[PDB]
Amino acid sequence: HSSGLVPRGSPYTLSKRINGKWSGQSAGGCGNFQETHKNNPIYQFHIEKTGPLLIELRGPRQYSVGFEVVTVSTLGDPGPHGFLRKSSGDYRCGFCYLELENIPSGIFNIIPSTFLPKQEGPFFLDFNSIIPIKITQLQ
Numbered sequence: 395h396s397s398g399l400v401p402r403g404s405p406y407t408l409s410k411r412i413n414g415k416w417s418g419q420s421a422g423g424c425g426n427f428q429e430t431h432k433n434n435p436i437y438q439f440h441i442e443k444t445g446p447l448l449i450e451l452r453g454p455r456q457y458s459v460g461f462e463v464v465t466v467s468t469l470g471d472p473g474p475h476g477f478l479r480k481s482s483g484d485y486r487c488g489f490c491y492l493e494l495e496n497i498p499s500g501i502f503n504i505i506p507s508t509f510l511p512k513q514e515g516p517f518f519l520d521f522n523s524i525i526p527i528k529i530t531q532l533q
């Protein structure tokens with residue numbers, strides 16, 4: 395993996411970049427498009443030690459983008475920073491992010507999308523951390 399765009403000397407000392415795209419079936423659009431949102435790409439990552447994670451998504455300037463993070467498996471006891479699903483928030487043009495300073499140890503999925511379906515194009519997902527994170531693509 396290459397790296398994202400992180401200041402020199404950032405507290406996030408590791409940056410792992412995933413390059414993907416929306417194309418054909420996988421251009422599913424946001425959650426409003428309930429028939430196709432679940433067709434978007436899905437990446438899966440492991441947090442080995444609870445600690446800070448910041449995820450950035452970039453797509454074309456002219457696309458409004460967002461992502462959701464879903465807890466798949468946390469084996470630790472039920473802490474305050476536990477969740478079912480979180481998101482980058484409002485769709486934004488070109489760039490969005492989510493900072494999880496105390497994400498629990500476990501398995502999570504991340505689903506990046508454009509606002510409307512059938513918006514084809516590239517994206518980068520950057521995972522900025524202090525501990526290495528294993529990632530794989532599910533679809």
Ligand SMILES: [Br-]
Binds near residue numbers: 396411412413
């Ligand atoms: Br790359």
Ligand SMILES: [Br-]
Binds near residue numbers: 419
């Ligand atoms: Br396809």
Ligand SMILES: [Br-]
Binds near residue numbers: 426427428429430
């Ligand atoms: Br729909």
Ligand SMILES: [Br-]
Binds near residue numbers: 432
């Ligand atoms: Br569903």
Ligand SMILES: [Br-]
Binds near residue numbers: 452518
């Ligand atoms: Br970039």
Ligand SMILES: [Br-]
Binds near residue numbers: 481483
């Ligand atoms: Br959220």
Ligand SMILES: [Br-]
Binds near residue numbers: 462480481
């Ligand atoms: Br959400």
Ligand SMILES: [Br-]
Binds near residue numbers: 482483485486490491
């Ligand atoms: Br946002």
Ligand SMILES: [Br-]
Binds near residue numbers: 484485
């Ligand atoms: Br929105």
Ligand SMILES: [Br-]
Binds near residue numbers: 452488489
């Ligand atoms: Br940007």
Ligand SMILES: [Br-]
Binds near residue numbers: 486489490491
């Ligand atoms: Br932002």
Ligand SMILES: [Br-]
Binds near residue numbers: 475
């Ligand atoms: Br958090």
Ligand SMILES: [Br-]
Binds near residue numbers: 464503
């Ligand atoms: Br999921």
Ligand SMILES: [Br-]
Binds near residue numbers: 408409410526527
């Ligand atoms: Br790394």
Ligand SMILES: [Br-]
Binds near residue numbers: 528529530
């Ligand atoms: Br990896």
Ligand SMILES: [Br-]
Binds near residue numbers: 412437529530531
């Ligand atoms: Br991957």
